[PDB]
Amino acid sequence: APKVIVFISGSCLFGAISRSLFKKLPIPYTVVLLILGAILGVVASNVPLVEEHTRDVAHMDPHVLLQIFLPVLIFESAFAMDVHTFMRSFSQVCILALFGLVVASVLTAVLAMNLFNYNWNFSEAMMFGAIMSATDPVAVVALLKDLGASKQLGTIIEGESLLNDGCAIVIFNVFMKMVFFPQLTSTVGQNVLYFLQVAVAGPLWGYAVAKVTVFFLSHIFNDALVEITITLAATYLTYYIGDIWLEVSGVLAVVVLGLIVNAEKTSISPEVEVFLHRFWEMLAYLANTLIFMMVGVVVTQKALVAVDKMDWFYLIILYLAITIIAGMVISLFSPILSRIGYGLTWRNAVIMTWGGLRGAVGLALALVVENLAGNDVIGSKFLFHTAGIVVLTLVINATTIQTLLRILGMSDISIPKRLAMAGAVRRIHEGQNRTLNMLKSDRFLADADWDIATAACEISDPYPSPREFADMMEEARLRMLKAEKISYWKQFEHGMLAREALRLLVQHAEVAADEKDQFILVDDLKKSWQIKGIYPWLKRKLEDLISLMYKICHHMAFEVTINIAIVLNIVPIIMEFVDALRISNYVFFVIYAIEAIVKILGLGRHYIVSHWNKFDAFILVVALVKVVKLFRLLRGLRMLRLTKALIPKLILVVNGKINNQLSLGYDVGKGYIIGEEEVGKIIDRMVDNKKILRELKHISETGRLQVVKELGLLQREHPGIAVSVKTRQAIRTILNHSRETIHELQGAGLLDEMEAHKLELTVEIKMKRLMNAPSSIPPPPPENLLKNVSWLAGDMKLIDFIKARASLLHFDYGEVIVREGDESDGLFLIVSGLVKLYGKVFEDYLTVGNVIGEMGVLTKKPRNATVTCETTVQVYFITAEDMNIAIDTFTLYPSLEYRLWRVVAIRIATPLIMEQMAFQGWTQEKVKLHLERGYLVDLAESHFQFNIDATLEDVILINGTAYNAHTREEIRSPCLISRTVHKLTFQYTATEEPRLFVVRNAE
Amino acid sequence: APKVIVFISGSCLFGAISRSLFKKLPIPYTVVLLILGAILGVVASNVPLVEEHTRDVAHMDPHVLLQIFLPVLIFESAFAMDVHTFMRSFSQVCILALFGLVVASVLTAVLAMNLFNYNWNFSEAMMFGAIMSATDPVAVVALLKDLGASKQLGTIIEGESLLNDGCAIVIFNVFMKMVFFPQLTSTVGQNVLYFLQVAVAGPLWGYAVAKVTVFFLSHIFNDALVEITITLAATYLTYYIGDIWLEVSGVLAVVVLGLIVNAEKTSISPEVEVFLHRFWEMLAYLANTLIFMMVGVVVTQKALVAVDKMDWFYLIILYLAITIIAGMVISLFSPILSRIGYGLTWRNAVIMTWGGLRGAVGLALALVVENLAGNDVIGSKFLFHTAGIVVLTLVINATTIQTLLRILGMSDISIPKRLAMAGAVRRIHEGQNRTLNMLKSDRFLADADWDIATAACEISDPYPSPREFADMMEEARLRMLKAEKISYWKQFEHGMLAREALRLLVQHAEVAADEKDQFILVDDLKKSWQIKGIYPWLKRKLEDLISLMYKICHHMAFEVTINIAIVLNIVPIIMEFVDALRISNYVFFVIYAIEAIVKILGLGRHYIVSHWNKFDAFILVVALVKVVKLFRLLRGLRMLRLTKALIPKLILVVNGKINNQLSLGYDVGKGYIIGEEEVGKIIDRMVDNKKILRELKHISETGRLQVVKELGLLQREHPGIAVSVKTRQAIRTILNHSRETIHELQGAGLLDEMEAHKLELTVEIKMKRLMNAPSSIPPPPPENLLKNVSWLAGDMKLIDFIKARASLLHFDYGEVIVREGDESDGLFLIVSGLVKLYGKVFEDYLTVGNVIGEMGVLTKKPRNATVTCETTVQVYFITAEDMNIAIDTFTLYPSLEYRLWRVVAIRIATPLIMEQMAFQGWTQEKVKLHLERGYLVDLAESHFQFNIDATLEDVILINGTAYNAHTREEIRSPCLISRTVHKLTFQYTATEEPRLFVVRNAE
């Protein structure tokens, strides 16, 4: 009976000890595992009891390593990494990784032939080179994450190393079959078929299983166990079907699964994500520690009795050569691949060519070779050289990478840490001092040991002239970039931005920051919503043209019955090409009679269908009838009916792809617009030069106008996808705000924990259902647009009155609707097309669902902005006389005048509160939500005098000329009343009736 | 080769299907698993291919069920439940569960003897009863959690059922050995020793392994993988060592390990807790579904071919009998055990005697019996009756428990849902409507489909006269209880309360709520800090009196060298009772010479120690020397030096127990005091009767005074533990507030996600290090108390000046220190003892570290409260003339006068802002932290006139008479200035100087 408990338990304990005790040291903890295994190996070589307890795990079957350890170690790497940045340039990175591994393997094999004195063939040398061409970027990515070189460079090298490991395993298997099992006699055509089976069919199987898994996972709500078990069983079944068919070369399939399931994380609950990540991390950790222990013991016991001085000399030469060729491949390949957008600097190339640590994949392959070799010296040489190279890398490179980085670019933390991390630690210290001073004046903690608290609560920092004009210009540019980054992050924390859009925006900000003089250029951002114009649009266009029983027999299972008949009939169809013939013939005749009477009924359909009717008639003609062997399969061509119902599914999937691109484009554009709008208000009081601030305002306005025009045209091009994405945005905003309300209720004590958990559960169910919505919502008719206006919704009589007196107007390109200075003819409502509103110095673009001329119909003022049609525009026109009639008709508390004045009041009051800036962090959304709570009260009830309390947070003058009760303080609209005022009255003037907007505090 | 992949995969798939499809249905999903297994069993009995694919998992070895399935199913139940309420009355619940299972098993066995026609012995019948005496409370606890009957009743029944399952397994094994393996022979002594091995040694082994595991887990910081692997390996090794020694009776050891590890959750990171809980949940889920599938197929294939009508009749009679005896045991046992503090009602007893569902433990035992029986009909009868009883319970009881509850107590949701859940949903709806109205007036989402958003964003509700005087009295009492519960929850969310203290307080509130007329009585709360007065205090007292080389050779390894020598010498000592004798004798002689020269050196220690020197001399006398066999072990009695170093460890563990009790007591007392203090201010403006509010204020004041006096005496009794717990409270408060500051920085965009993660990591490391602090911090000397005063700290010259002129006064019980009306002699500082400050109608208790008479030395006003010594009090006295000299000496910006005025200003201004309550949700802590930011500015610099801005949040008049610039507004101190005021000036009056406190808004 084999003894394994002590070895596994001791490996776990020693891994914990080495992991905890080598946290601070720069050396990796795995070399400690290697030396511990070496000591255990020499002890077992001396002591027989330790040998008995060690021999059953130290010398295992090679299929344990090939079938259990390597799939886990590769799947954890594939599953752990983020893919949304790596899968943008997936094909090119795949090509780069494959080419690099192939060339490095060939140079290592040539070195193994000419330099080494062992009589080694090309197959043995190529397996040798494939072993020593598998790297590990863990140190490089760890030291590049915190240094802030790029978040788009660690993912690239991570994915490249993952593909490197996969192809290294594949070629190792290909050459191991030739070396150790030479009885096989596959030909050139068989080799080509095997290459097609490995490099194409495997990833396709993994992709299909992954797609089915996400499809079934998206329909499970509030069940963590079902999702976890389904995901794990799908992983095992993918591995098993790949393993029994492609042997160890069928790892690529599971790799693909690990990527695809990682990409579609929205169908997986976050608790399921964290559980699966920790699960696979623990499995890979156990495999890693076991591999290092067993290679240590088996390299001390066996491979250290057949070594000479020439072996050590060859190990040193090979260590030099692998570094030389690792530099050579990146020198000859990476500068050509400048299309990545992450062009190599002098520091980055040397960092990623020096931190090429070796890992446990090559050690496992060397273990497999040593097990398969037997008593031959080839396994001993393989294990000795692989272990020596791993040791040399893990010492020298892993300890000297930081020193090399300091030599290259001083390893300096730069500004992000120089200043930011200083602010936080200074204000954290001040808050802690304030809390401690509050605690010292308590009544119950007055006897606490304050030395202990003070010492154990503080934290530590982890880390005129043209020249003057250029200096303030650079300072203002850096300040604007910093403020834009703050705005993007604040938009993220409120749930108004997705993670990918925020990452794109901050990547553009960081790219523009380190340049000498470059702001956020629209051309870099334009590659977020322009990606629709590829083959998906053409494919959707091509499929658009292709597409008593049609209504009475119509149901959710009308054609599904025929589809079920096809699915039931494929099984007797498919057995002919792969006794029981009589029953199959009888059911064939029954189904043929059924479809014959179906076609007889369809003869009354007036032959409307052109393709499907002809194909069904041909099918019936074939079914009604050595040519017998041919006719046995000729009747089996009855799959012409599946492609009739498959066209909508392909249309749906191309709609999903277009929507997935358009959502990211819209998020990027909206975030940029909001960031510029906030930064223009922020930088107004932080610049001490009129020319500099004028230039900054000009460039910001130009960029914002270009972005908004492009977004409007993108909406115009395809309405269904735009309506779908905007609806999803609105629903996400509402759900996020309701979740915030739930959390605020829970914090105030008014909600128990279980009640809050139930409400949060309902909110998450609604979010998961929203994330699987239709990807193309049809645009609404203009009547729905007229009925859904903010000041018209809810009143059926008013809706009928306005709809009866409204007219439709159509305008072409270049027409002018209304010029400046003219009297207000009426009120517009854009229902189709973009339009440009320009006047006095300002210019904006209005799109569908927008209203023009509310101020003109309210205050009877002349127009002040010319409106020109950018496209063919359809508008709704309401005459001003009808608007006056409707105003004088409705006299309820939700008055037409009241709502009409409230809308323009909020619209004119938001910029004043934004420009005020008596605080910080007052975003446009939270300013708008603060102004929404406020209301205006007519002065007729209060005898034209208002008494000011301090319960108001802000008071704004939206109309007329103010007159306070002290010295008749006179102010002009629109203006934010000065903080130091008193109670104000008003005089009834028939020419102008002033009105004001007052906002209370939060209850 | 066996085929198992299809069966396991289909079991997982069918479990997912049944679990998802039967969420809404009231029936449990496991009966669907049973019918699916039955259909598969009849198909395999017909079709041979399905039989080949089913027979290898359907008919497994019984040791797979005994060694893998039952340990997992019991450990998951033990590990999942919370224990801090169940382990309060652990021994009594254990006794109750054991007695109930024993009697019910007896009753069942008698029924299986007399009624059934099978010739069954006592052992077979007792194994039958042990199989059918194992229940499952899952439905009862699920329907009692949401109903809100009691949070202290679900845990009790959960633990009782867990112990029931464990003892059922134990007795099943005991009788299965007698039934199926009768070759063994048992005596009285052998059976007694086996009982001692099972019922004592196993739980002790589990407890010891658990203690070692928590000890090693508490020293690991920032390593999830190490903690997870150590915990899982500890679980396996506990199971293995218990297994190979006790067979299936190691479940007690693994249950003890699960409970003890779950109790000590503070040494385990929360991510580790959630991972381990999900891991064991998934394992138990797989075991459950597999067991139900194979019992279905086996009962269909085998047990359904040997049944008669009499078998069904006996099944019905047994189903009635098990319910009858389940009622009988709870009728005869539970009313006696009413000492737990959770008495049984009429509804609860019937609910917990009707919802006795059967589970997979009994099914697994029946499968084991069926496997062991062979071709005998006993296994068929066992499986048939067990499966029938499980089916009948899972249908009838699991579907009719809700109907029975609605018959008993209407299953009505009561008030907590009637009102609370209505407020939240109404408010949530209003917030959603506000957000939607904000979104409709946007510029980019103006074309969204608002019908879809409106329909998919709304949520649904889950659910004079004495009589008049009594009505308002009841309304006021319910309002006070609700406000107290809100205050306790708000204290929890701020981190000022622990979970156990909050649970105790809300349990007392709910207990007092449903009574006719009963407030929060101090006697119920007194059982939180009175639990010190048990044997731990006496044990600590008894151990207190027991306890050139002592300093020069002293180090961290001085006596540890001798301890290491003892640890090295036990191995040659212990082998005598269990060739190599010469080396052992030589090292014995070497160690004896070493300790002889140690005693020679110790001869110069003047023979100071009495016990240890005598024992060491006796050890040396023994070591310097068929009696040879006795002397071979006589020299082995050298374990008298470990108990010298073991006394401090036992003192430390009893200190830890005392501290663990005292922390809960202090938290309960502090939370009650704060809740009463807030509720007294809240209810002031919510009561419309002077008599009712006077009575409520009187009872609240009496309770608060009693609690604060008891807490002061508890501090007085033992200073070290009190200082330790108060220091831990202060450090926890500071760390929580710093974490809040980090989150607020992250929300405002000024901190990146990675920087915030690093700062949070440092905060969690500090919290984990704080949770493992010493449990007895020595009290400070009075000099440290004088140097740590809030208005004296930081100034070394002032500290020296005050310390030079301070005197120490000692007073006994009953003395009066200063009476009312007398002139202020000076300033006090309590450094030892409790003291009572009573005067004018008010009365309070002051403890160490408190200052009396600051107002008297500031404003030179006569004393207004007599101060009487409740105990022997040591105080620090500073003369008033020296205080005046110090005031007139220091003239820097931190003035003594300014600091004293700020302290008394915050002290006098906190109640005014507390009473104002302009915005609800104002806690005392937040009011204090808001007042801390404010400062007072002297009127001499501003020419005795102050200009009011609206940048102030609150203005308070702490001294003098105010005189505004309008009508010379006159107000008297202390008073909160009316919100409607203007800029005020002041006149220089030599007799009294008005001073005021102004607080700005948040930047």
| Resolution in angstrom units | 3.1
CB < 8 Å to A421, chain B: 755
Residues 6+ apart with CB under 8 A from B373: B180, B379, B380, B382
Q: Which amino acid is at A631?
A: F
* DSSP code, position A935: B
* Structure-token match 């089916």, residue found: B391
Tokens representing A594? Answer: 């059924």
Instruction: Check A755 against B439: CB less than 8 A apart.
Output: no
Tokens representing B516? Answer: 């006719």
Residues 6+ apart with CB under 8 A from B894: B794, B795
Tokens representing B68? Answer: 């893998």
Residues 6+ apart with CB under 8 A from B614: none
- Tell me how far CA of residue B511 lies from CA of A781, B348, B420, B673, in angstroms: 60, 16, 19, 19
DSSP secondary structure string, A246-267?
A: HGGGGHHHHHHHHHHHHH--TT
CA-nearest residue to B275 within chain A is A275
CA distance A135 to B95: 61
What region does A833 belong to: left with phi over 0, alpha with psi -120 to 50, or beta? Answer: left
Distance of CA B640 to the CA centre of its chain: 39
Name the E strands within A325-479.
none
Handedness of CA B883, B886, B892, B894 (dihedral sign): negative
- Residue B196 sits at the vertex; the CA angle it makes with B190 and B197, to the nearest 5 degrees, is 85
Strand partners, B963: B970, B985
Residues 6+ apart with CB under 8 A from A548: A604
- Tell me how far CA of residue B512 lies from CA of A455, B132, B407, in angstroms: 43, 40, 26
Instruction: Check B233 against A9: CB less than 8 A apart.
Output: yes
> What is the distance between the terminal CA atoms of chain A, rounded to a whole angstrom?
76
CA distance B448 to A779: 9
Residues 6+ apart with CB under 8 A from A515: none
Q: Among partner residues B278, B487, B734, which is closest to A224 by beta-carbon distance?
A: B278
Sheet containing B975-976: which strands, arranged edge to edge? B975-976, B952-957, B996-1000
Assess contact for A284 and A73: CB atoms under 8 A: yes
* DSSP code, position A862: P
Strand partners, B278: none
CB < 8 Å to B21, chain A: none
Assess contact for A165 and A77: CB atoms under 8 A: yes
Assess contact for A906 and A931: CB atoms under 8 A: yes
Three-class SS of residue B829? strand
* Structure-token match 């069918």, residue found: B14
CB < 8 Å to A240, chain B: 5
Query: Is A854 one of the annotated binding-site residues?
Result: yes
CB < 8 Å to B777, chain A: 449, 452
Q: Which amino acid is at B470?
A: A
Q: What is Dmax (Cα atoms) for chain A?
A: 114
Query: Is B732 one of the annotated binding-site residues?
Result: no
Interface test with A, best of B734, B784, B955, B980 (most A CBs within 10 A): B734
H or E segment to which residue A93 belongs: helix A90-114
Query: Is A853 one of the annotated binding-site residues?
Result: yes
* Structure-token match 């003109």, residue found: A856
CB < 8 Å to B920, chain A: 1003
Interface test with B, best of A443, A447, A764 (most B CBs within 10 A): A447
CA distance A220 to B761: 34
* Structure-token match 């005087």, residue found: B469
Instruction: Check B444 against A726: CB less than 8 A apart.
Output: yes
B940, B962, B829: which is closest to B883 by C-alpha? Answer: B829
Q: Among partner residues A20, A439, A750, which is closest to B220 by beta-carbon distance?
A: A20
CA distance B928 to B935: 13
Instruction: Check A1001 against B489: CB less than 8 A apart.
Output: no
Assess contact for A391 and B722: CB atoms under 8 A: no
DSSP secondary structure string, A757-772?
A: HHHHHHHHHHHHHHTT
CA distance B653 to B775: 9
Instruction: Check B734 against A457: CB less than 8 A apart.
Output: yes
- Tell me how far CA of residue A571 lies from CA of A566, A576, A577, A625, B360, in angstroms: 9, 9, 11, 20, 40
Judging by beta carbons within 10 Å of its beta carbon (0-12, 13-18, 19+), is residue A194 exposed, middle or buried? middle
Instruction: Check A420 against B16: CB less than 8 A apart.
Output: no
CA distance A759 to B279: 26
CA distance A822 to A861: 9
CB < 8 Å to A727, chain B: 448-449, 452-453
Assess contact for A668 and A729: CB atoms under 8 A: no
Q: Which amino acid is at B352?
A: M
Q: Among partner residues B5, B435, B755, which is closest to A734 by beta-carbon distance?
A: B435
CA distance A361 to A74: 9
State the pairing for strand pair B873-879/B961-964.
unpaired
Instruction: Check B749 against A848: CB less than 8 A apart.
Output: no
Q: A-B interface: how many C-beta pairs under 8 angstroms?
A: 340
Assess contact for B217 and B268: CB atoms under 8 A: yes
Tokens representing A676? Answer: 């510029």
Instruction: Check B13 against A727: CB less than 8 A apart.
Output: no
Instruction: Check B282 against A416: CB less than 8 A apart.
Output: no
CA distance B737 to A194: 64
Interface test with A, best of B452, B458, B952 (most A CBs within 10 A): B452
Around B408, how many Cα atoms within 13 Å sit in the side-chain half-sphere? 15
State the pairing for strand pair B835-839/A842-846.
unpaired
Tokens representing A575? Answer: 């057995």
Three-class SS of residue B867? strand
* Structure-token match 């490099």, residue found: A199
Instruction: Check A722 against B447: CB less than 8 A apart.
Output: yes
Count Cβ atoms below 10 Å from residue A356 Cβ, excluding itself: 21
CA distance A315 to A391: 11
Instruction: Check B13 against A233: CB less than 8 A apart.
Output: yes
CA-nearest residue to A449 within chain B is B727
CB < 8 Å to A1001, chain B: 919
Sheet containing A851-852: which strands, arranged edge to edge? A806-811, A873-879, A826-832, A851-852
Interhelix angle A558-574/A642-682, rounded to 10 degrees, is: 120
Sheet containing A996-1000: which strands, arranged edge to edge? A975-976, A952-957, A996-1000
Assess contact for A164 and A375: CB atoms under 8 A: no
* DSSP code, position A461: -
Assess contact for B873 and B832: CB atoms under 8 A: yes
CA distance B292 to A820: 81
Instruction: Check B726 against A445: CB less than 8 A apart.
Output: yes
CA distance B844 to A423: 44
Count Cβ atoms below 10 Å from residue A125 Cβ, excluding itself: 22
Instruction: Check B848 against A447: CB less than 8 A apart.
Output: yes
Query: Is A864 one of the annotated binding-site residues?
Result: yes
CA distance A518 to A509: 10
CA-nearest residue to B933 within chain A is A434
Q: Among partner residues B493, B726, B745, which is closest to A447 by beta-carbon distance?
A: B726
Distance of CA A336 to the CA centre of its chain: 28
Instruction: Check B275 against A275: CB less than 8 A apart.
Output: yes
* Structure-token match 């140190």, residue found: A139
H, E, C per residue of A49-89: HHHHHHHHHHCCCHHHHHHHHHHHHHHHHHHHCCCCCCCCC
Assess contact for B30 and B394: CB atoms under 8 A: yes
Strand partners, B868: B816, B836
Tokens representing B44? Answer: 């395999």
Instruction: Check A448 against B9: CB less than 8 A apart.
Output: no
CA distance A79 to A74: 9
B560, B229, B935, B261: which is closest to A20 by C-alpha? Answer: B229
Strand partners, A829: A851, A876
CA-nearest residue to B763 within chain A is A459
* Structure-token match 């405002």, residue found: B748
A254, A259, A262: which is closest to A203 by C-alpha? Answer: A254
Residues 6+ apart with CB under 8 A from B17: none
Sheet containing B865-869: which strands, arranged edge to edge? B816-818, B865-869, B835-839, B842-846
Query: Is B788 one of the annotated binding-site residues?
Result: no
Q: Assign 3-state DSSP to chain A and report helix, strand, coil percentages, each to 5.
A: 65, 5, 25
Instruction: Check B225 against A903: CB less than 8 A apart.
Output: no
Burial A154-188 (b: 16+ CB within 10 A, else e): bbbbbbbbbbbbbbbbbbbbbbbbbbbeeeeeeee
Burial B848-866 (b: 16+ CB within 10 A, else e): bbbbbbbbbbbeeeebebb
Assess contact for A54 and A297: CB atoms under 8 A: yes
Output Rg (C-alpha) for chain A, integer angstroms.
Answer: 37
Judging by beta carbons within 10 Å of its beta carbon (0-12, 13-18, 19+), is residue A557 exposed, middle or buried? exposed
CA distance A982 to B355: 70
Residues 6+ apart with CB under 8 A from A832: A782, A848, A872, A873, A874
Burial B785-796 (b: 16+ CB within 10 A, else e): bbbbbbbbeebe
Q: What is Dmax (Cα atoms) for chain B?
A: 114
Around A629, how many Cα atoms within 13 Å sit in the side-chain half-sphere? 2
Report the gap between the CA of B819 and the closest CA in chain A (Å): 23
Determination method here? Answer: cryo-EM
Residues 6+ apart with CB under 8 A from A320: none
Assess contact for B973 and B930: CB atoms under 8 A: no
CB < 8 Å to A777, chain B: 449, 452
* DSSP code, position A417: I
B639, B642, B662, B774: which is closest to B718 by C-alpha? Answer: B662
B180, B87, B238: which is closest to B372 by C-alpha? Answer: B180
- Tell me how far CA of residue B707 lies from CA of B662, B671, B713, in angstroms: 14, 11, 10
Instruction: Check A493 against B749: CB less than 8 A apart.
Output: yes
CA distance A830 to A6: 78
Burial A29-60 (b: 16+ CB within 10 A, else e): bbbbbbebbbebbeebbeeeebbebbbebbeb
Judging by beta carbons within 10 Å of its beta carbon (0-12, 13-18, 19+), is residue B10 exposed, middle or buried? middle
Strand partners, A828: A852, A877
Strand partners, B259: none
Burial A580-609 (b: 16+ CB within 10 A, else e): eeeebeeebeebbeebeeebeebeeeeeee
A623, A651, A626, A650: which is closest to A635 by C-alpha? Answer: A623
CB < 8 Å to A980, chain B: 949-950
* DSSP code, position B873: E
Q: What domains, with CATH codes, occur in chain A?
A: 62-409 (1.20.1530.20), 547-645 (1.20.120), 782-890 (2.60.120.10), 911-1000 (no CATH)
H or E segment to which residue B227 belongs: helix B224-246
Query: Is A431 one of the annotated binding-site residues?
Result: no
CA distance A519 to A365: 51
A488, A480, A485: which is closest to A667 by C-alpha? Answer: A488
Three-class SS of residue A946? strand
CA distance B841 to B843: 7
- Tell me how far CA of residue B149 lies from CA of B154, B267, B413, B488, in angstroms: 9, 32, 10, 20
CB < 8 Å to B742, chain A: 424, 428
